[PDB]
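Notebook, student rotation project (T.W.).
Task set for the rotation: take a protein with a known small-molecule partner, predict the structure of the complex, and write up what can be learned from the model alone. Partner molecule chosen: magnesium ion. Sequence and SMILES entered below by T.W., checked by me.
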Amino acid sequence: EFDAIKIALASPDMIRSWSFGEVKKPETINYRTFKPERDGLFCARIFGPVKDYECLCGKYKRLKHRGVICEKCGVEVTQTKVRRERMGHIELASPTAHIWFLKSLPSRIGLLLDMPLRDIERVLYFESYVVIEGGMTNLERQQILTEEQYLDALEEFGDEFDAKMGAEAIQALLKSMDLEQECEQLREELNETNSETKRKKLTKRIKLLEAFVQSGNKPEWMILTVLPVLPPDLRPLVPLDGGRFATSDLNDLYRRVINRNNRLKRLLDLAAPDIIVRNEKRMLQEAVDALLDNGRRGRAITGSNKRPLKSLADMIKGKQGRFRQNLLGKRVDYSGRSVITVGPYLRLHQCGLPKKMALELFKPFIYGKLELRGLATTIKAAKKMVEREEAVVWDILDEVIREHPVLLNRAPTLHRLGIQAFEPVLIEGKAIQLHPLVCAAYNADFDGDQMAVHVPLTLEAQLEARALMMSTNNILSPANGEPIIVPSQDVVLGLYYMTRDCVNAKGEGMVLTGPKEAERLYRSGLASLHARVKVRITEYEKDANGELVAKTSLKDTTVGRAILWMIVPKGLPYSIVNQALGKKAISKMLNTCYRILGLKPTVIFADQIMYTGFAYAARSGASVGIDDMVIPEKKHEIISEAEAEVAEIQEQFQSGLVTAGERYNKVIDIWAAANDRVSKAMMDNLQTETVINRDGQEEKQVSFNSIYMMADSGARGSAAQIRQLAGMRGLMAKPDGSIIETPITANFREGLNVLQYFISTHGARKGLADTALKTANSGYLTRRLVDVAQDLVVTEDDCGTHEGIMMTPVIEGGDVKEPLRDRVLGRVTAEDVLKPGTADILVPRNTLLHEQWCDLLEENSVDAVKVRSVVSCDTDFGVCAHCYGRDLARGHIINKGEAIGVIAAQSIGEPGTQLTMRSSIQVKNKGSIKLSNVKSVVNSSGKLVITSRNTELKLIDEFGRTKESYKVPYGAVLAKGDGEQVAGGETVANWDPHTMPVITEVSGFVRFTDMIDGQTITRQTDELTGLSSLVVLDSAERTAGGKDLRPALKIVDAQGNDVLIPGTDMPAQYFLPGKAIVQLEDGVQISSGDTLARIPQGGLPRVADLFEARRPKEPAILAEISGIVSFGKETKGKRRLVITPVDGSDPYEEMIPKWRQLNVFEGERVERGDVISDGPEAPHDILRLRGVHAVTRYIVNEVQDVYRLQGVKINDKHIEVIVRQMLRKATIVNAGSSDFLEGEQVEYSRVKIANRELEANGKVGATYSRDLLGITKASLATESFISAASFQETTRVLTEAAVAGKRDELRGLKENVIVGRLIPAGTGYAYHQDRMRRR
Amino acid sequence: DDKMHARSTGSYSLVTQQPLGGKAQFGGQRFGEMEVWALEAYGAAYTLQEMLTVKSDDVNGRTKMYKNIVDGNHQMEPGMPESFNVLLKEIRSLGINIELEDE
Amino acid sequence: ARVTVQDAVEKIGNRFDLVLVAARRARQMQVGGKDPLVPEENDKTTVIALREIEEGLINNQILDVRERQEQQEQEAAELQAVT
RNA sequence: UUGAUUUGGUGAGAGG
DNA sequence: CCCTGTCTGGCGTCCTCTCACCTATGA
DNA sequence: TCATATTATTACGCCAGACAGGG
Ligand SMILES: [Mg+2]
Ligand SMILES: [Zn+2]
Ligand SMILES: [Zn+2]
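Predicted structure of the complex:
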């Protein structure tokens, strides 16, 4: 029907072509009758007749002459909705410049006429004059004029002289502004200057000057001359219940503009003096500016009472504009809403739906069914039948329900599992019965929740509800590989009580010929549900190629494990039920069933799990009592020993032996130790309290205490909650953030007294305030993420590359945190992984790594896999099917089409609620040493000291994988060496961080080069020891006579000649920095490893500051080019740093703020990506210095650290694709033979297809530079202005798109959700393939 | 039975062609923004297309759909939403010339 | 009856084209003129379409072959009725 | 050709 | 002229339910 | 009833982005 939406400026001829009549009078309506005004705002001739095909006043009351317009009516003759499309125009007496092009920041008329905003407004509000082609006088064109400047000029240049003001003058300036001429000038000005600031100031002005010439937008279209009025139907005038009309705000705005315009026409008729018509035109200017965007000028106008009234731009922008309130989200027919309840008899593809809601939602299907049978005739009869609800429409209703799915939806839908399609089962009742397992997907408890039902009307929508959105199809969460139909709380208690054991029961050690008579012995009353027993089970192992082989054997098991074996499908082994089956074990039971036997046995087995869990939890009778919370007998003596310890510490505090901070630290330490001891006392007293004999002496076992099974099963409860119900509830913290030294020694079974409950209320009010304010940032994070993603659709099958990121296991310094099988599960390898022995093709180079491949990776102990990542995908406008990976909720690769940006954005932002808002190296294991980034030297004693700061100390095992990693500073005492074998727990590293070592490479004698006591260094003989040290001063304390003196130590031989560095001809002089203290004095012979000086010195907003890419306040500074380094100017704002490369060109430098403790010396050579100071590091520096793969590893590690600290499983594909959407823009460095500009920022796919269709020719391409935009700056900088207008500020984006003449080749998800068509991702990707093919 | 509510077809608002909101007004459910993102997350392109064009806003689409349902033909004739043409007239009522291009 | 469409997804391996093929078929049965290739257990046209897909007798190629056969039948009908 | 007004907007409180 | 406080604008969660209250003037 | 047309409170918290000031 139509391609792209084009936006441009509105010419006065274009506004007269939209229009149907000039709106003169401001008179709205008659108000005493019902008729409007002829001819006012709500006219007849200008727009249309209120009534359909009627002259409002009187003629044509049938259907013959539609169109005639008599003189007595001055009325058109069409439809009732004809006025909604017709718009009027107000002939503004005095020109008024647009507020969107005068105050957009930056203003469109501000950087175009080369005039400051302040001066532009002055003249615009009749407060300053502006010259326009004066003539032969001493005045510029842009230069303004004041009353005094004009008065004198008026008497001076009375002849050829022009100096107007207001929009009129402004219009002229714009009108008489040779665009083309300015281009060359600006272009020549940019090529004839070197000023950095000017360059950017000139490139931003020429960009908007050449863009205006590229389109059909004129400079004189900025000023509004023929103001357009919105259709009445769109500014509706309806009365509320009563006798008055509740009028809209736009009618106030238009009525004021028309009142003022009529006054201004009458004053220009009457020839009023100058100051009267200046105030009149100024009031018209402010009235127009208030109509368009109210409140952007000084304080907004108001009708009733002090609240400002809502203008047109406030009908567009905001949370309640048209995008976010009526075009992205709509209210919807065939929909319903009610309170949910359980109904556990359901199968997990069906839900209960009440009869009253079912007869209301399915009224047209029932009408069609009733008309088909022949029971009635006309539609009315059917509506009377279902209004009466006779006895025959319920069979009609059960025949329209049967195979027709519905979309259930819980009201805060965060990820895609919050809309699932069921089949209805009709309910006597008024509450939606919802299958319990599905509740863990919706985050739906049953404490008063409500859900909405939606009906797929058409046939393609019924098939999408059955084939994509059915609840049997969503059994794996799309964020990872974990099953989302995990059995939640009652059913794991029923299983944990069923499959367990006790050391004596009915039927101990009897033998049973099958699981059927195991259940028969449980039901008849001859054995117990947990009584250990040899049974004969027949497990089917499918060891052949798709053939199930029976093996039958006698397992020593219990009765309950055989009864649960009657429900397990064929292929699973018996050892999946042989254990005790908590919650992690039943989750991996369903996961192994899904990986082996597929989907249909896993659906039917999930239902049979839920049924048998509910049934035996009912048979269990697992209550909770007051006696179940067993108080430790050792608890009171532990509290008295802690009270004796705080008594000892305070008796030392009365005598002043210890400090106050050490007292507070000792009290918090002994109460933490006593808390851990009380928790261990109660945990022994709960986990093994049952001690029952069997045929003789006693024997112990794990307890059948009720609260212990609710904790050990993982149903509801943890260690901390069961700790607070029996042991002491810790040391609660006051809202100051610091802890309180007197704990809450009473649990909940004993009574809390008053003060302890008040401290508890501190600790809990902080948590409720944190959740109720955290949810806003979590939701706004999901919004920013799905609007930066929004476009990215799997659109190929292979990009045809060999690049991809290097997935290693991540190791922080403790034991190996996340194994390689969690990171390289289901992601397609980049090059073929060599087997760790020698040069073998273990896996090929384009294989998906599912579980079988990952097990053959874990057997061979594969180091790290080079795997394909989304950020390395070469596909223009989308992601190919291999560089994404596995489907994650489907076992296979991602299909051609499935929108991965939206599921990724939802999977990152959905756990936003669970996240929070507000010496030396000791080895642990026993293995082999390896060093990386190492340049070292052996000292005199033997400990290998390091001459490199950035050395990584890895502990590699005997197999080949890397198990530990650490960072060792410059100059540390390593107890070990390279390639060595150590023992578990042996200290291998040592240093002093408070004393920066200035250790050497060679030996010799020490001379004090440029070290003079009195100006350079100072004499501070030590007080308490006597062994003095010449203390080196810094460059700020010494005066300007000797500030140029750099103290240093250079090593010589026994004669005095300079001992050179081994490898060069340069001596090894070390320039001493500020605040140093000389350790080894003059004449002392040195060696390696000996110092030459003493140098003394996060949750959810972290996720936001990583995706939005803020800078930290003190970033780590780096080096943009390798080579030698040196210092510069002495403290003029900053302290300089000059880097001269060995082979490369010199002139790069950087002025470091001198408040940082540096890392580099003067004789040190640096590299790109090498640190100069320490602290956090901004991602833009990673991108422009190290590489794209470096910054994607930086973001995925720095945000999986937050998601792992709070314990959420998210696969890394989602963070890699939001990282792709961050660094999608690029900047040009060398324009080459293309049509770009020098420092123009252009999107990367554009410049790559440009120089890839030019490089296939003879011409060599253009060399770009990638840039990392934060997510809101990157979604507002898009080549599709509806995508950047449905999101944040619409004023800025619509003026930028309007003055650029931008066009929206739709080509994404939200443009097609706005404009009302098929999404180009899902089922509609075939439709968009067809439409893109047929052009 | 103060929370149970359902709507097939009834009255709508004035300015927009979408259904009214609430229970005291016999109105339908606001299919908000995150539900649209959840349908985009699946492949529900046709479910979303009737969810924002036929069931909600487009007047020719919904009258043709009601007649198509009661004839026994589950098929939608979509058209363009009315609130987007309301957007075009509110943007166009500024000094902005927004259009709809070639066939 | 119908709980999962997994075999139909196996025989048309895209999971997004299953909806389109079964929608084309269920419109051939609903308005439609045509009668199903499979016994119906009082299932609706959705489940009868997907149930035809699972036994491997409807895909995109069979529907285009049948529509070419109907176009040739209409061509022969027009030619043998007029001339 | 067989019938009608809240949405608009504010404020306050509540549910998940 | 390159850092720099300082000022100005622009964000800040979805869905639902109940109730009340709505410009002054004026010959 | 039918045209006439706008004044005497302050009490967010970042976080970019643009601007006059000065070593
Ligand atoms: Mg709840
Ligand atoms: Zn007439
Ligand atoms: Zn690729």
